[PDB]
Write a protein that binds this DNA or RNA. Structure first.
Ligand code: NA
Length: 211
RNA sequence: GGGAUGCGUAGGAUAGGUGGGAGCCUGUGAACCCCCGCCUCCGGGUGGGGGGGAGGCGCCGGUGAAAUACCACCCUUCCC
């Protein structure tokens, strides 16, 4: 059965039965061919009501920007010298941001470590930039990545199940819209083949993405 | 359509992809034992039955490109 977003938002209350505050997910089977590089969906979006989770942000910057990342609220901040701390297996954070001037050292020394974990700072994921305080403030306000897997599916967290239905409904549209804004011009056919709403431990519920 | 299947090497060992995840399961019967179906890369995996009677599993750690439970969306090959 196909539910509306407003319907699905309200059902999270009932789907969420684990003994913790479950994250609310959105999944979509995408209308692309993920083989071809030009059909890749990748980008970020500021959820209008936040993730509702605290995100330990590390910032590796240079010069004044180290002060900027500090004041933007990044949990740990340092120069190229915290590379050697991750080289020793520190790795206690959720997201790495970085200014372009350090990405030469960061890439070559931590690419092989941060890369496979989707933690490498990357322009395409909104994690590299001299606007490093806006990146941190955008993350801390609940910006999320989304990047199709090779199977052509795509997934994103869009809230906690403790949120009011109407706020979850908002976050779901916002992410749905941001998907459609990254619909590759080469992608033929229906873009959002299917779209489901679920919680971490809970069952799925297919939704009407234009509702 | 229905049913399964998912193992280079390193690693408890059979890690399809990715996202979520700090919890999941269990007297409405856990580990463990036996019997049978199927699958098998011959390591094992998996379904069912009987016994059993309170503990399994994850997180952590280590290994690894990636980490284990659990959940979701997909993908694969196979049988009917
Ligand atoms: Na683990």
């Amino acid at each position: 059965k196909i539910y509306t977003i407003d319907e699905a938002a309200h059902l999270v209350k009932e789907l969420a039965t684990a003994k913790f505050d479950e994250t609310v997910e959105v999944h979509a089977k995408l209308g692309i061919d993920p083989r071809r590089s030009d059909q890749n969906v990748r980008g970020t979006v500021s959820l209008p009501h936040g993730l509702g989770k605290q995100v330990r942000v590390l910032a590796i910057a240079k010069g004044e920007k180290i002060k900027e990342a500090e004041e933007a609220g990044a949990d740990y901040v340092g120069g190229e010298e915290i590379i050697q701390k991750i080289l020793d297996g520190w790795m206690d954070f959720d997201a790495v941001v970085a200014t372009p001037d350090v990405m030469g050292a960061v890439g070559s020394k931590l690419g092989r470590i941060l890369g496979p974990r989707g933690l490498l700072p990357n322009p395409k994921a909104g994690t590299v930039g001299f606007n490093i305080g806006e990146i941190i403030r955008e993350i801390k306000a609940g910006r999320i990545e989304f990047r199709n897997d090779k199977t052509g599916a795509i997934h994103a967290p869009v809230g906690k199940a403790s949120f009011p239905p109407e706020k979850l409904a908002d976050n779901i549209r916002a992410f749905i819209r941001a998907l459609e804004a990254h619909k590759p011009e080469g992608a033929k056919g229906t873009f959002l083949r299917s779209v489901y709403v679920t919680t971490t431990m809970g069952p799925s519920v297919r939704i009407n993405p234009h509702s």
